[PDB]
Amino acid sequence: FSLNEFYIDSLKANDAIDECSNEVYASAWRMQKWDIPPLSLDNKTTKDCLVFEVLHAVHNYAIYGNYLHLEEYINKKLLLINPNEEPDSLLFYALAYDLKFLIRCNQSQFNCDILQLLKENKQMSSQLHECFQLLLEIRNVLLSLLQSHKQLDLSDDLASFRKYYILELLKISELIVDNLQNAFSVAMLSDALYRKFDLADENLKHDIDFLSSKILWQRDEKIDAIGMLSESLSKTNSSIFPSISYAYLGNWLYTTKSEKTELVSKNYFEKSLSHMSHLNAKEKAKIYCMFAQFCDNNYSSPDLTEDFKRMEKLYFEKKNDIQQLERLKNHHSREMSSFIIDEREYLRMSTFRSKMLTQSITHYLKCLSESDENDVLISRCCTMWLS
Amino acid sequence: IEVSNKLFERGHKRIAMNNYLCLYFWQVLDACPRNVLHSLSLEIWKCYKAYDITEFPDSLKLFFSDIMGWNFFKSPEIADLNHYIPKTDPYEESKLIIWKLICQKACSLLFKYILLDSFIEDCIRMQELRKFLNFPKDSIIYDSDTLVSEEGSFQWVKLQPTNFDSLSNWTKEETLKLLNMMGKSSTHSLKLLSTYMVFSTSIIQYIIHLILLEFDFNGNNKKQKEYVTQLILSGLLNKNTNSIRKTCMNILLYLRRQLGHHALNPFEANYWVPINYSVAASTAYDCHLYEQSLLFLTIHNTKTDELDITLLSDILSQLPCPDAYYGIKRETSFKNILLKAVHEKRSPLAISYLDAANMYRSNGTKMMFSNTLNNAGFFSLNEFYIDSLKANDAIDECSEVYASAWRMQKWDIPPLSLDNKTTKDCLVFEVLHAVHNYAIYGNYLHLEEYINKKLLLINPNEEPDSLLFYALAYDLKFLIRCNQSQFNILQLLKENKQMSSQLHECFQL
Amino acid sequence: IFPFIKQQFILFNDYSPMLSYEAIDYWKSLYILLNENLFVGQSSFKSVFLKWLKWHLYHLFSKEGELPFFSFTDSSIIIFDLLMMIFYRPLSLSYITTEIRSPFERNLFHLKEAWPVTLRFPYTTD
Amino acid sequence: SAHKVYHPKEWSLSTCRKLIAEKQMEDLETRLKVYDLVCRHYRPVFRHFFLESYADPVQWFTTQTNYARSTAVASVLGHVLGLGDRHGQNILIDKTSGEVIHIDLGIAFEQGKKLPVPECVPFRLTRDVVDGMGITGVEGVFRRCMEFTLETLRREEDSLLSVLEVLRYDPLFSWLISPLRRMKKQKMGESEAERAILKVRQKLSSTLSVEASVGELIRIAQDPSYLALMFCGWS
After folding, report:
1. What assembly does the database describe for this protein (chain D)?
2. Are B422 and B414 in contact (CB under 8 A)?
3. Cβ of D208 and A337 within 8 Å?
4. Which residues of B touch A224 (CB under 8 A)?
5. Exposure letters C67-88 (e unless 16+ CB within 10 A, then b)
6. Which residues of A touch B358 (CB under 8 A)?
7. Cβ contacts of residue B59 below 8 Å, gap of 6+?
8. 3-state secondary structure (DSSP) of residue D42
9. At what angle do helices B169-179 and B223-236 cross, to 10 degrees?
10. Helix, strand or coil for residue D93?
11. Does the CA dihedral B50-B55-B61-B63 come out positive or negative?
12. How far is the C-alpha of B51 from the C-alpha of B68, rounded, in Å?
């Protein structure tokens, strides 16, 4: 959006864009530049010109701290939208109502969290292109306009509401606004606001770090996300019991092999399981079941299981050779030392294989039990069970 | 050809004199035939800046630039050897070696420098033979080394009043206050009475290492040892001049290189003079000798294991080696990702994306963004960004701003001043705007004269990319004055079929 | 600032003959020697301004006294010749030996009083 | 001799190996703790070879960088080709430039894994060799050079794979090395060609990105848990 804004004012310098169009205001309301004059209320407007006019009204009613003239503006806007029967009008209606709740309620100014609207279907719900667009960005700019003037803040708990972009970004990334770069941009904004507003050691910092690491890893710069989540998780944090972040970082570490298998299993998944029983929800099943996925990837590796089979073979043939030689006594002693070392290694690796397979089957069963959303894995569990 | 190749198999570094170079092989070479010039050995132009071009006629400099572009275009000579001669010289024999070095330097000054030369002759005449006269040729020993006690240089009023001292008179004062502990030869007059010639730091810096080596373990005890320690420490940290710090670091390294008598380790020999190497390394980093700064940093970390992590990052940021910036990992935040992606200039994990996010989240950047856009190749995006910055005035610079002035073919941006030394981007823009204007209007002599004027001033800077402009001057001249077949640009690489380890310096724009 | 002045100039109002002589000569020297830009910098913008001066605010000086930017001065002809020869030509200045014959009056008013220079050398000084 | 000169207080190079070799039938944690103790006694002294013993700082940095590049390229090529023994004796650093040349490449193509004590580390990166490129560990020059070597070796997978194939059909190249032979080197019926070439394809397989791949390689080369099991002495 910033490169887009650069392009627009560059075009304005060339006097070519005729800055009363939709794209100029689509840049304006997204870059929070409340200096370009809004389009006339009597004159017909597109979606983005309307959104920018409404947001300029919100800005000038938040600088001077009002909840009533904003109502007049919103209602005068909503009066003159429907008769043309534009398909997007319904969306505008939603916007108006959401705005109404941001300047009425003295606490928890948002309705239904929007992210739950996408979580209830447990997918993107694939309504259609025109049914999923542009709401979350206006919610973001509204929320940041709430505390544009500290005379409109007048409290500290709002500055903790300020920092709940995590819902907005779990919504935009997984995709009402239909993008990913905006998710990273708002995550950067949330990090800046956390380092700007309040104490730099809390749990909100860790949650923001976790969301940013998710946004980065999905962009596939895997090692950078690994580092950013491990800087805040593997740390003497405040009230550090985050199970979801621990499970996600363990899965990522085993994905890119950036950490040892035993170390990641003992430091990033057992920590998550120890801090369980306080998030009994769908995320709980997600944690056991990402754990089962990681343990299955541990078991299902082709190369290491090939060496495992060769190792079972040489263990059995060394047992046979011990039987043959027991029937060169010093040679027998050296051989028995060598293959007792081999045998103890065999027991260690076989016990590890049994433990990982049983644990992954059990956590697959749990991933099914706690949440019915993830179902297909039972077949996978079946393949890992009746084999 | 034989003259050219025999000129270089040995060291014949003696054309350093500026008045003696236009007489030397830079005015005779111009008159030599062009085919012969092409047939000359490559080492003539291998060291394009080692020659002192202080005194040169305009035409000679123009011919130098033309031939230098011609020689760059075929078999580029950017690659150079790294190492020079060492400093370690090899108990009475050690003192003999120090005195031998001092007297060899004195004889060299005598040969090179008439009043001053006569004074050095008298100073060398100042009587006892310590076998050190064998190394100088015996003719000087017989003539000026029974001999007349009366000085043959000055007549009690002819002596110089010891003026015109160097800006590095700091070493002169140090040598004066140092040698006044046990005077072997009143070599004292070489520093206090012969300090006339701006010698005033040449011989002083030449044998200050030697006299400091003499002072160390000169006797069982010596306050002058604490004096050398204090003066080294005082010279390392300094103000208003980097040259004094450079000289002090040179003495530090010279003393560190020497073999320490009855020294258990070369390590502790590097610490014969008690000092903290961390402040020395910080000074070297401020002295812009980054490899020397890293040497001091690693010697300090070998002693104290107390490296300055921020200092190490600052050092590795500017290190010329391409595979730097990754030695020290900075724990990742939304500023480390951006800075790491800027250096690579890569499209995956787009630095354009991170810069775009930070430009609106408000989480140095006014140039990093422009350079990332230019390096990625989105020249129109960088044009838009530069125009937006100019509209906001936030850039307020004539650097970046001119990188996209010629690349985007916008010939309305005024050029930078021709007199001032200017960066390669403004350099290229000046040349290219000139050629565009004289293509529009068609005056060939004007373009030639302008390129000559612009190529005359570039030489003294000792900038790494001066030869790169010599190439551009020769190239556009060839592509301009010809009536047909304007090419002269790819064929070299087609023969190479690869970069041929040319490094970013040789091949760029 | 030069582009802003040029935009203000050639507007028939700011572009006036009231400007002192040789100011345009200095501008041309700056544009063709140091800047050395002729793409709307020399022979295009300077030529346009000179043509506007020769057409607008022509033969009507702001002040009649001292021949300010008047046609009586040969310096105007010298500047015109210099500008004509500076339009992308080798030795673009092409100007030498103006033959002032001491009409320039380099020494200022009270030049006889300036010739204080009689006692230039102080007693036992310098 | 550098460790016997710079730090005479610590244990000699023959003082620690013997006790490292003393534990041969023990668990992994015992080896890890003994290696931690030994590497704490022996500080890395290689970095002094380049410094104040070669030349002025420009040459010192040039030879340190060239040593880093040469050891990175040699290490990547050893991993891709499965190079085996990497003794200190079997690496030669050129006093003129510092680059490392690997002599005695008689054990390669997984043969090193067949030794009585398998070389679990891909390429030797013990504490001294890591110190060699300076105060920095295996980061900067080393990691980037390894990345570039792996990327280029994967770009030319077809031609290099064909070359290794023509070695496979060559009857002289015995992709099989006798176990007794293998034993000797450390002391100082299936066609193995197809399995070895499959391993080489896997080491050049682009399933895992090159950056994280060389990161994992560096991790195994530096993690003391692996290095404590490499071999008795071997350092």
Report:
1. Interacts with nbs1. This interaction is required for phosphorylation of histone H2A.
2. no
3. no
4. 332, 337, 349
5. eebbeeeebbebbeebbeebbb
6. 188
7. none
8. coil
9. 170
10. strand
11. negative
12. 13
Q: Quick check: B446 and B455 in contact, CB under 8 A?
A: no
Both tokens of D206, joined, read 């682009």
CB-based contact D92:D100 (threshold 8 Å): yes
3-class DSSP string for B149-182: CCCCCCCCCCCCCCCCCCCCHHHHHHHHHHHCCC
Quickly tell me which residue has 């941001």 as its tokens: A102
What angle do the packed helices B336-344 and B351-361 form, to 10 degrees? 140
Residues D32, D38, D40, D42: what is their CA dihedral angle, to the nearest 10 degrees? -140
For every residue of B296-360, DSSP letters joined together read HHHHHHHHT----HHHHHHHHHS-SSTT-S-SSPPPP-TTHHHHHHHHHT-TTTTHHHHHHHHHH
Q: Shortest Cα distance from B430 to chain C (angstroms)?
A: 9
Contact A172, A190 (CB under 8 A): no
Helix (H, G, I), strand (E, B) or coil at D105: coil
N- to C-terminal Cα separation, chain D: 14
Is chain C touching chain A, with at least 3 CB–CB pairs below 8 Å?
A: no
> What is the C-alpha separation between D190 and C47, in angstroms, rounded?
90
Q: Collect all residues with Cβ–Cβ distance below 8 Å to B377 and sequence separation of at least 6.
A: none
The Cα D101–Cα D107 span in angstroms is: 16
B211's tokens: 């006299």
- Establish whether chain B is in contact with chain A, requiring a minimum of 3 CB pairs below 8 angstroms: yes
Cα distance from N-terminal residue to C-terminal residue, chain A:
53
Give the closest residue to A207 by CA, choosing from A283, A109, A117, A293: A283
Q: Residue D218: which of D133, D161, D157, D158 has the closest Cα?
A: D133
For residue B99 the two structure tokens come to 């005195």
Interatomic CA distance for residues A142 and A57, integer angstroms = 11
C-alpha to C-alpha distance for B113 and B104, rounded to whole angstroms: 14
Q: How far from A104 is each of A22, A50, A110, B332, CA to CA, in Å?
A: 30, 22, 10, 40
**Residue B387 to residue A10, Cβ atoms within 8 A:** yes
Would you say how long chain A is, in residues? 387
Give the angle A350-A355-A360 at the CA atoms, nearest 5°.
130
Q: Do A223 and D212 touch (CB under 8 A)?
A: yes
| CB pair distance less than 8 Å for B433 and C2 | no
Closest among A307, A310, A298, A257 to A384, alpha carbons compared: A298
Secondary structure percentages of chain C, helix, strand, coil, to 5 = 35, 0, 65
Query: What size, in residues, is chain B?
Result: 509
- Of the partner residues C2, C3, C88, the one whose CB lies closest to the CB of residue B438: C88
Q: Return the bridge partners of D169, or none.
A: none
Q: Is beta strand D100-102 parallel, antiparallel or unpaired with respect to D91-93? A: antiparallel
Decide if B434 touches C, using CB distance below 8 A.
yes
Counting as contact any 3 or more CB pairs under 8 A, the partners of C are B
**B264/C contact by beta carbon, under 8 A:** no
The minimum CA-CA distance between B440 and chain A, rounded to whole Å, is 24
Q: Is residue B100 a contact partner of residue B135, using CB atoms and an 8 Å limit?
A: yes
Contacts of A317 in chain D (CB under 8 A): none
* Composition of chain A by helix, strand, coil, percent to 5: 70, 0, 30
Q: C41: which strand partners? A: none
Residues of chain B with Cβ-Cβ distance to D98 below 8 Å are none
Please choose, from the candidates B184, B247, B201, B208, the residue with its C-alpha nearest in 3D space to the C-alpha of residue B101. Answer: B208
Nearest to D48 among B83, B267, B307 (CB): B267
Give the residue from B315, B300, B168 showing the smallest Cα distance to B246.
Answer: B168
Q: Residue A37: phi, psi to the nearest 5?
A: -60, 140
CB A318 within 8 A of CB A343: yes
What residues have CB less than 8 Å from B480, skipping those under 6 apart?
Answer: B435, B444, B447
For D101, the 3-state DSSP assignment is: strand
